[PDB]
Amino acid sequence: GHMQESYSQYPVPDVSTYQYDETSGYYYDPQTGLYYDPNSQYYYNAQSQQYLYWDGERRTYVPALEQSADGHKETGAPSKEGKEKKEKHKTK
Incomplete structure:
Protein backbone atom coordinates (compact mmCIF):
# COMPACT_ATOMS: atom_id res chain seq x y z
CA GLY A 1 0.00 0.00 0.00
CA HIS A 2 1.08 3.57 -0.81
CA MET A 3 -2.13 5.62 -0.15
CA GLN A 4 -3.93 6.72 3.07
CA GLU A 5 -1.00 8.01 5.15
CA SER A 6 -3.48 8.35 8.11
CA TYR A 7 -2.90 11.61 10.07
CA SER A 8 -4.75 13.68 12.79
CA GLN A 9 -4.14 11.73 16.03
CA TYR A 10 -2.83 12.14 19.64
CA PRO A 11 0.55 11.39 21.35
CA VAL A 12 1.25 8.08 23.19
CA PRO A 13 0.86 9.03 26.93
CA ASP A 14 1.80 7.08 30.07
CA VAL A 15 -0.29 7.58 33.27
CA SER A 16 3.12 7.45 35.06
CA THR A 17 3.52 11.09 33.81
CA TYR A 18 0.16 12.33 35.26
CA GLN A 19 -0.42 14.25 38.50
CA TYR A 20 -2.47 12.70 41.35
CA ASP A 21 -4.78 15.26 43.05
CA GLU A 22 -5.33 13.68 46.50
CA THR A 23 -7.86 16.40 47.36
CA SER A 24 -10.32 14.38 45.11
CA GLY A 25 -8.69 10.98 44.21
CA TYR A 26 -8.20 11.50 40.41
CA TYR A 27 -5.12 11.91 38.23
CA TYR A 28 -4.87 15.07 36.08
CA ASP A 29 -3.56 14.67 32.57
CA PRO A 30 -1.82 17.94 31.50
CA GLN A 31 -0.99 16.53 28.00
CA THR A 32 -4.78 16.57 27.29
CA GLY A 33 -6.37 18.58 30.16
CA GLN A 67 -21.37 0.62 25.17
CA SER A 68 -22.58 -2.98 24.49
CA ALA A 69 -26.21 -2.16 23.62
CA ASP A 70 -28.20 -4.31 26.12
CA GLY A 71 -28.91 -1.31 28.42
CA HIS A 72 -28.92 2.14 26.81
CA LYS A 73 -31.12 2.96 29.88
CA GLU A 74 -28.55 4.85 32.01
CA THR A 75 -25.18 6.56 31.33
CA GLY A 76 -23.56 3.11 31.28
CA ALA A 77 -24.77 -0.37 30.32
CA PRO A 78 -25.09 -2.49 33.57
CA SER A 79 -26.79 -5.38 31.67
CA LYS A 80 -23.76 -7.76 31.40
CA GLU A 81 -23.73 -8.82 35.08
CA GLY A 82 -26.11 -11.80 34.62
CA LYS A 83 -29.04 -10.30 36.57
CA GLU A 84 -29.24 -7.54 33.94
CA LYS A 85 -33.01 -7.63 32.97
CA LYS A 86 -33.82 -10.11 35.82
CA GLU A 87 -34.70 -13.80 35.24
CA LYS A 88 -37.63 -12.76 32.97
CA HIS A 89 -38.80 -15.80 31.00
CA LYS A 90 -40.74 -17.73 33.77
CA THR A 91 -38.63 -20.01 36.07
CA LYS A 92 -38.98 -22.64 33.45
Whole structure:
Protein backbone atom coordinates (compact mmCIF):
# COMPACT_ATOMS: atom_id res chain seq x y z
CA GLY A 1 0.00 0.00 0.00
CA HIS A 2 1.08 3.57 -0.81
CA MET A 3 -2.13 5.62 -0.15
CA GLN A 4 -3.93 6.72 3.07
CA GLU A 5 -1.00 8.01 5.15
CA SER A 6 -3.48 8.35 8.11
CA TYR A 7 -2.90 11.61 10.07
CA SER A 8 -4.75 13.68 12.79
CA GLN A 9 -4.14 11.73 16.03
CA TYR A 10 -2.83 12.14 19.64
CA PRO A 11 0.55 11.39 21.35
CA VAL A 12 1.25 8.08 23.19
CA PRO A 13 0.86 9.03 26.93
CA ASP A 14 1.80 7.08 30.07
CA VAL A 15 -0.29 7.58 33.27
CA SER A 16 3.12 7.45 35.06
CA THR A 17 3.52 11.09 33.81
CA TYR A 18 0.16 12.33 35.26
CA GLN A 19 -0.42 14.25 38.50
CA TYR A 20 -2.47 12.70 41.35
CA ASP A 21 -4.78 15.26 43.05
CA GLU A 22 -5.33 13.68 46.50
CA THR A 23 -7.86 16.40 47.36
CA SER A 24 -10.32 14.38 45.11
CA GLY A 25 -8.69 10.98 44.21
CA TYR A 26 -8.20 11.50 40.41
CA TYR A 27 -5.12 11.91 38.23
CA TYR A 28 -4.87 15.07 36.08
CA ASP A 29 -3.56 14.67 32.57
CA PRO A 30 -1.82 17.94 31.50
CA GLN A 31 -0.99 16.53 28.00
CA THR A 32 -4.78 16.57 27.29
CA GLY A 33 -6.37 18.58 30.16
CA LEU A 34 -8.46 15.50 31.04
CA TYR A 35 -8.58 13.70 34.35
CA TYR A 36 -7.88 9.95 34.52
CA ASP A 37 -9.12 7.62 37.32
CA PRO A 38 -6.99 4.56 38.25
CA ASN A 39 -9.99 2.21 38.63
CA SER A 40 -12.06 3.78 35.80
CA GLN A 41 -10.04 4.04 32.56
CA TYR A 42 -12.85 6.36 31.24
CA TYR A 43 -11.18 9.80 31.08
CA TYR A 44 -13.02 12.97 32.19
CA ASN A 45 -12.91 15.90 29.81
CA ALA A 46 -13.74 18.58 32.41
CA GLN A 47 -13.93 21.22 29.63
CA SER A 48 -17.26 20.06 28.22
CA GLN A 49 -18.11 17.49 30.92
CA GLN A 50 -17.61 14.61 28.48
CA TYR A 51 -16.46 11.14 29.51
CA LEU A 52 -13.93 9.78 27.01
CA TYR A 53 -11.46 6.94 26.69
CA TRP A 54 -7.98 6.61 25.24
CA ASP A 55 -8.11 4.16 22.32
CA GLY A 56 -4.45 3.40 21.62
CA GLU A 57 -5.45 1.38 18.48
CA ARG A 58 -6.83 4.61 16.96
CA ARG A 59 -4.43 6.89 18.95
CA THR A 60 -7.19 9.42 19.53
CA TYR A 61 -9.84 10.20 22.14
CA VAL A 62 -13.36 8.90 21.67
CA PRO A 63 -16.40 9.46 23.95
CA ALA A 64 -17.12 6.66 26.46
CA LEU A 65 -20.88 7.42 26.66
CA GLU A 66 -22.46 3.91 26.77
CA GLN A 67 -21.37 0.62 25.17
CA SER A 68 -22.58 -2.98 24.49
CA ALA A 69 -26.21 -2.16 23.62
CA ASP A 70 -28.20 -4.31 26.12
CA GLY A 71 -28.91 -1.31 28.42
CA HIS A 72 -28.92 2.14 26.81
CA LYS A 73 -31.12 2.96 29.88
CA GLU A 74 -28.55 4.85 32.01
CA THR A 75 -25.18 6.56 31.33
CA GLY A 76 -23.56 3.11 31.28
CA ALA A 77 -24.77 -0.37 30.32
CA PRO A 78 -25.09 -2.49 33.57
CA SER A 79 -26.79 -5.38 31.67
CA LYS A 80 -23.76 -7.76 31.40
CA GLU A 81 -23.73 -8.82 35.08
CA GLY A 82 -26.11 -11.80 34.62
CA LYS A 83 -29.04 -10.30 36.57
CA GLU A 84 -29.24 -7.54 33.94
CA LYS A 85 -33.01 -7.63 32.97
CA LYS A 86 -33.82 -10.11 35.82
CA GLU A 87 -34.70 -13.80 35.24
CA LYS A 88 -37.63 -12.76 32.97
CA HIS A 89 -38.80 -15.80 31.00
CA LYS A 90 -40.74 -17.73 33.77
CA THR A 91 -38.63 -20.01 36.07
CA LYS A 92 -38.98 -22.64 33.45
